[PDB]
Ligand binder design. Sequence first.
Ligand SMILES: NC(=O)C1=CN([C@@H]2O[C@H](COP(=O)(O)OP(=O)(O)OC[C@H]3O[C@@H](n4cnc5c(N)ncnc54)[C@H](O)[C@@H]3O)[C@@H](O)[C@H]2O)C=CC1
Ligand SMILES: NC(=O)C1=CN([C@@H]2O[C@H](COP(=O)(O)OP(=O)(O)OC[C@H]3O[C@@H](n4cnc5c(N)ncnc54)[C@H](O)[C@@H]3O)[C@@H](O)[C@H]2O)C=CC1
Ligand SMILES: NC(=O)C1=CN([C@@H]2O[C@H](COP(=O)(O)OP(=O)(O)OC[C@H]3O[C@@H](n4cnc5c(N)ncnc54)[C@H](O)[C@@H]3O)[C@@H](O)[C@H]2O)C=CC1
Ligand SMILES: NC(=O)C1=CN([C@@H]2O[C@H](COP(=O)(O)OP(=O)(O)OC[C@H]3O[C@@H](n4cnc5c(N)ncnc54)[C@H](O)[C@@H]3O)[C@@H](O)[C@H]2O)C=CC1
Ligand SMILES: O=C1C[C@H](c2c(Cl)ccc(NC3CCOCC3)c2Cl)CC(O)=C1Sc1ccccc1Cl
Ligand SMILES: O=C1C[C@H](c2c(Cl)ccc(NC3CCOCC3)c2Cl)CC(O)=C1Sc1ccccc1Cl
Ligand SMILES: O=C1C[C@H](c2c(Cl)ccc(NC3CCOCC3)c2Cl)CC(O)=C1Sc1ccccc1Cl
Ligand SMILES: O=C1C[C@H](c2c(Cl)ccc(NC3CCOCC3)c2Cl)CC(O)=C1Sc1ccccc1Cl
Lengths: 324, 325, 323, 328
Amino acid sequence: ATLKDQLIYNLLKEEQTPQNKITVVGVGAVGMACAISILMKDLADELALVDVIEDKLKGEMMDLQHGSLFLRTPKIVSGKDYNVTANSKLVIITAGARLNLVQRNVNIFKFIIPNVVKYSPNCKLLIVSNPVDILTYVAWKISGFPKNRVIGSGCNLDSARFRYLMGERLGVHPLSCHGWVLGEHGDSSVPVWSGMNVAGVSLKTLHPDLGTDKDKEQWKEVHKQVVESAYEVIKLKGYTSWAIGLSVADLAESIMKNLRRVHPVSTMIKGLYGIKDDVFLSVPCILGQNGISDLVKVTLTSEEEARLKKSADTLWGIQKELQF
Amino acid sequence: ATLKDQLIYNLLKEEQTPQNKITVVGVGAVGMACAISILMKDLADELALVDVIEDKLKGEMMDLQHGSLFLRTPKIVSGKDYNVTANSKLVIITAGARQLNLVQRNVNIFKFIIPNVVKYSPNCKLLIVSNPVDILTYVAWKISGFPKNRVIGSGCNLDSARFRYLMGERLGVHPLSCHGWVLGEHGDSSVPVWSGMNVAGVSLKTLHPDLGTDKDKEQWKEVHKQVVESAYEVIKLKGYTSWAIGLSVADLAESIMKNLRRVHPVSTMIKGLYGIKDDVFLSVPCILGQNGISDLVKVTLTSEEEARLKKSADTLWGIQKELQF
Amino acid sequence: ATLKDQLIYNLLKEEQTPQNKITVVGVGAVGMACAISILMKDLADELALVDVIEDKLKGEMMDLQHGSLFLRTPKIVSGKDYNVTANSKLVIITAGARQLVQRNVNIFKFIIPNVVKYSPNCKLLIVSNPVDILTYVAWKISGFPKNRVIGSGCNLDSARFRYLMGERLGVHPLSCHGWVLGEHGDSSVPVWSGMNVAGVSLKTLHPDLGTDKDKEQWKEVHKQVVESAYEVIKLKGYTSWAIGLSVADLAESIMKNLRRVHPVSTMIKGLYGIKDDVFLSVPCILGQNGISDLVKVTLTSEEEARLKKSADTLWGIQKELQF
Amino acid sequence: ATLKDQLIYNLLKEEQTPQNKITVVGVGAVGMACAISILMKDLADELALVDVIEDKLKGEMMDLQHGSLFLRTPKIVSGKDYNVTANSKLVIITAGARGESRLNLVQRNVNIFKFIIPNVVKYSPNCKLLIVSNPVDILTYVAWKISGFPKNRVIGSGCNLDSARFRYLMGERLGVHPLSCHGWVLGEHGDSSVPVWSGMNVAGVSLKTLHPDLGTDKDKEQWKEVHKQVVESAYEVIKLKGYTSWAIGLSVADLAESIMKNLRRVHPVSTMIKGLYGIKDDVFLSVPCILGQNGISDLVKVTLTSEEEARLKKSADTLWGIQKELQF
Ligand SMILES: NC(=O)C1=CN([C@@H]2O[C@H](COP(=O)(O)OP(=O)(O)OC[C@H]3O[C@@H](n4cnc5c(N)ncnc54)[C@H](O)[C@@H]3O)[C@@H](O)[C@H]2O)C=CC1
Ligand SMILES: NC(=O)C1=CN([C@@H]2O[C@H](COP(=O)(O)OP(=O)(O)OC[C@H]3O[C@@H](n4cnc5c(N)ncnc54)[C@H](O)[C@@H]3O)[C@@H](O)[C@H]2O)C=CC1
Ligand SMILES: NC(=O)C1=CN([C@@H]2O[C@H](COP(=O)(O)OP(=O)(O)OC[C@H]3O[C@@H](n4cnc5c(N)ncnc54)[C@H](O)[C@@H]3O)[C@@H](O)[C@H]2O)C=CC1
Ligand SMILES: NC(=O)C1=CN([C@@H]2O[C@H](COP(=O)(O)OP(=O)(O)OC[C@H]3O[C@@H](n4cnc5c(N)ncnc54)[C@H](O)[C@@H]3O)[C@@H](O)[C@H]2O)C=CC1
Ligand SMILES: O=C1C[C@H](c2c(Cl)ccc(NC3CCOCC3)c2Cl)CC(O)=C1Sc1ccccc1Cl
Ligand SMILES: O=C1C[C@H](c2c(Cl)ccc(NC3CCOCC3)c2Cl)CC(O)=C1Sc1ccccc1Cl
Ligand SMILES: O=C1C[C@H](c2c(Cl)ccc(NC3CCOCC3)c2Cl)CC(O)=C1Sc1ccccc1Cl
Ligand SMILES: O=C1C[C@H](c2c(Cl)ccc(NC3CCOCC3)c2Cl)CC(O)=C1Sc1ccccc1Cl
């Protein structure tokens, strides 16, 4: 016999499958921050890591594995083969690298998505890789999954950054500062001024110039700073990890726990705000165990609606020229 | 009136001195992992970041600041100037770089760090991470002039954390329930205490007398060898180590900030113990509270285990006596 | 030498002052739920319990003490003497039996001076009913500034409202935003204008929201907040879990200096035409100094009238109180 | 078109089976403490409450439901009908009623279990049973016999609270946190529990090695009193507040964490100890068990002294004597 057999008597020995499994595809700067944020929030009972670079993949896995004593996730596995992803509740795509970007990542997704669907056919896909709104469509098209199980990060980080800036401006915690950034993630995002409030008190009601160029306090700058900061962190640090890692983990929480909380995430907007083309844009979504079960019908101004239609038109133009 | 004045009526324009403040010196791979682990464990009400590279420092601070919505730490500040560290309860040194050269290099760095830290937070607890951790904890203690309790070195905390994971894998039991102690000099010269290795109070050395011996048919010595091998393997594979050390440092921070009085394998002034008569810092099980190392566990070591600690102490002192401050 | 001396070497046996201490006065049904909710949220490094009934007080303390292994609060102390409360950051008053005005005042006449004596720089969190009247009583006796005297007020009312709204819409209470303000209890005010999900005003989509002409009768959501309160009392005899969790949430904001907005009772003199020393619930920024700032909610003529009537009613009682 | 339809567009109505469900049977002092501890530890996505007293059950459910804003458990349901328990991963039995004999209590609670257990198995056939109701060691057997579930899916609280109280007392004595103070109380839960002095340590330093008279009557520091106080305290809390809730509530939640999360942590819980320590009868006693998604997958073979072994055999003999006279 052995010391294990000497010390421990076994009752049953079937290698039981996990119940709450999460997969992170692309153990990059973003991917690894999502991983640690998920592990510390105790959202999964099994974490699977997938990457093309086998050496980095093994090292990242081993590093997380050594922290097991301080974690409540008993199984951290990795592999270049997608067999490690089998029966994931949530699969997060943070793969690629920081029109060429579109084309390059589409080819990467051509392999990633069919492999993911092959091992976890009833999973929820959370796309992070940029352009997130275009790649969510790419994933949805390749997977053949229903629109609810294809979730794009979209304006989640944008709204997270907006609520922080608003929070600093007012000297109130971002949790209590309510604001919504919707539409196309990035530069072309839309700040919904009407929805901006603290304790149900509309900021646009108290300050009618809110978001206009006429504004003496320059509140439009709060949205400009969301865009400026993104590029500033890239200029300073070379990458972004912590803010996106935490935001992705927050979405994962609502999904894994079936919380039914409203989040600003990229979804099939076709049929809303006059949009006709198969494009994904960020709107407030109820996130549960089935992904996006319900969508909040935000009342948008003519100006706000126009911007979402223009984003949709722009995004479709690229999407129609894509070879799957 | 501004929209802020229109929306909010002020009772008092604040501001209390920081209450549960933590400072991270060196926003490197290790430093930033300590930062995120501390932020997620809701240990501080204020986090301060210090580095020589201002661009990276500002970037790392801003990135953490954007995640504020998902955090319960209302103030994340940074700066090259140590004025940002003022009134810290715990100051963590993760400064320098990866890799005698590393000793004299990091000693020179500490000659500025430590006096600046003491200047702004004179009643703080120092948590040294930068390598050689055992030597640099002494360096910090000497420069600071702080009592032995307020100078805490990471030491064999990560070593024991890695050991408990490996032991855990071997036995198919969670590392939390697998008890083992790696003590002495952090790194290659660490000591696995085979007498203390247990699960549910059942001594593994009692059941398997060959435990941690050359004749070990199951080769349990490899569990300690793998702790050393893994360290260099992660370095070969990804280029650095962050997550494992980040989590371990946060666990120590928890006992220090919350005054938990939990026992941890950390580097402390081992003079007067195990025949050591020199001013050297080695890892032993320490009770971690609001005053740092208030008490230490007197582990019964074998003549071979004691000899290793004395040899480590002799080696470490040899370097330490030739150091200039 | 003793086994303790043989096993452990001591470096220092000094100081030991509590950095994040919380005190619960009145280990009743409400008090004990506040205690467990605080302990599990890891908000204090020391918990102190005070009561007149010494037997129950010791029993409740010992029970919590046995759970120490599963907690991250190293010191749980109790006593009829307020010496146990010394150096508290937050003191919660859940003392005096449930139904009441003049009775609890006589209880406070001793509780508050004893609390101030041992923790003079603490934040007071009043839970004891009538919460709005007793917050004034505490503020008057303590002599503490407006910010360090916090009343639970409409925190539980809004918590119940957001749950009901949440059920109605099939959305989590966290994402369902609504504000119940004014006098805690029956005379509370639902602010329909502030009611929203993702910044989308429910009153904008449904103009009949919280009126009599509402075919969906959303005015029932507020009625049910009041009805439920009395229903839980009819069914289980008391209320503990809902209030315990709500008090812990306020405690979190205070202890961690979060600066989050909460519906809590504060000195409302100078707002909505109120000229008297009365405490009513308004959205307040909660931190290390308590109520540092308050949100100036735009109220309708009817909403304002209700708050003025509550203020008038509350002052009428308060002016006839002997101090 | 209602305000809900105006505000929210629906993608799917697709209501799925609860993934991480927990059921609490008996919303008493113990039951409700287990409930709040579980809710705050974010272990379930659905909590179901069952009791005979419909009014108290509705009130307890509504009270928890109002706290939903401060919780991460989206569904809190209750009912006298066990249809509410359907698809529960873990079912906890805290259904009982605490100047009566111990034999009156056994058959009293067996009559109660004769309805509870078949109803639980009917709606959640692949669940893990966590027995709390006293005598826990006897009632875990009763549940196992009625359910027909394998040994692993029938978990009794046993000496979990006993060890939790012991580690607190040891912790106070040494001025070290209970987490860092390691000790094991095994065997029959209650008065007849066994303190395993060989396993008593801090940082792997055996206390019995440093102090050989540890736990003996010889003991100059009288460490055996640490175990006596575990028993004395139990009755003292009962004398003082009339019941015990917080300590047991937290302990049950800790077990639930290991089960729900499949942590594979070692816990002192009651399991069938047949063919171990010379016991040949179908009896459940507390030993260190590895708790995962399948319940008790493995058990730690603790080296016991002749005296320690004798106590476990005597407990087993006593427990079987009652168990063989029971009707099912
Ligand atoms: N709010 C949002 O939606 C945000 C999105 N992002 C995006 O996240 C993505 C990832 O960013 P970083 O991690 O910083 O990039 P990176 O360069 O650090 O990491 C990408 C990783 O993916 C791996 N990878 C490449 N091809 C792969 C394949 N076929 N299968 C699996 N793994 C593969 C690479 O080896 C690398 O480890 C980018 O597209 C970036 O723009 C970044 C910030 C915010
Ligand atoms: N168990 C343990 O004790 C472990 C200790 N370590 C050690 O931690 C240390 C840091 O490692 P990494 O972060 O990976 O190195 P790194 O190269 O990523 O980071 C060091 C950082 O310190 C900064 N720095 C340098 N001089 C400074 C000064 N005067 N003031 C402030 N900041 C300064 C650098 O700019 C850099 O950002 C190393 O000495 C390493 O050996 C690593 C792993 C485990
Ligand atoms: N949202 C809110 O503001 C709510 C407020 N409450 C209120 O909380 C209060 C407490 O309720 P329960 O705990 O259910 O009452 P209870 O009858 O269970 O408990 C009150 C406790 O205070 C103790 N006590 C009495 N005089 C004392 C003194 N001088 N010093 C210290 N302790 C003393 C009693 O011995 C008893 O243990 C009531 O006034 C009740 O109306 C209840 C629910 C919600
Ligand atoms: N370490 C351990 O194992 C401990 C076990 N216990 C035990 O826990 C049990 C419960 O204790 P308390 O809650 O204080 O008792 P209690 O009197 O407060 O509560 C028992 C509850 O079960 C309900 N109940 C009765 N018959 C039922 C049935 N057929 N179906 C569903 N519910 C039913 C009652 O209506 C009541 O609400 C007792 O047997 C007690 O000895 C207590 C402390 C520690
Ligand atoms: O989408 C990203 C990706 C981003 C990033 C990465 Cl990871 C890498 C590169 C860039 N940009 C540049 C770098 C060189 O010059 C052209 C493109 C960006 Cl912008 C890092 C980042 O923060 C975000 S979020 C965001 C981006 C723009 C506006 C608003 C928001 Cl919220
Ligand atoms: O102390 C460290 C520092 C270490 C590290 C870092 Cl951060 C960076 C580099 C190295 N290796 C090399 C690099 C060039 O050639 C000589 C040294 C190591 Cl080894 C990375 C690491 O894991 C640990 S912990 C450890 C180290 C050795 C044995 C046991 C343990 Cl627990
Ligand atoms: O203030 C309280 C105290 C309350 C309680 C307690 Cl703790 C004790 C007793 C009662 N009522 C009765 C009991 C029998 O007949 C007379 C008085 C109430 Cl109503 C329990 C409780 O839920 C609240 S909050 C509330 C009260 C009324 C409307 C809206 C809200 Cl939010
Ligand atoms: O099992 C229980 C049930 C217990 C309890 C309750 Cl809830 C109620 C009553 C009693 N005793 C007596 C008192 C009056 O006459 C009949 C029975 C006990 Cl003992 C309360 C309690 O703490 C425990 S744990 C325990 C019990 C005895 C020794 C050691 C431990 Cl760890």
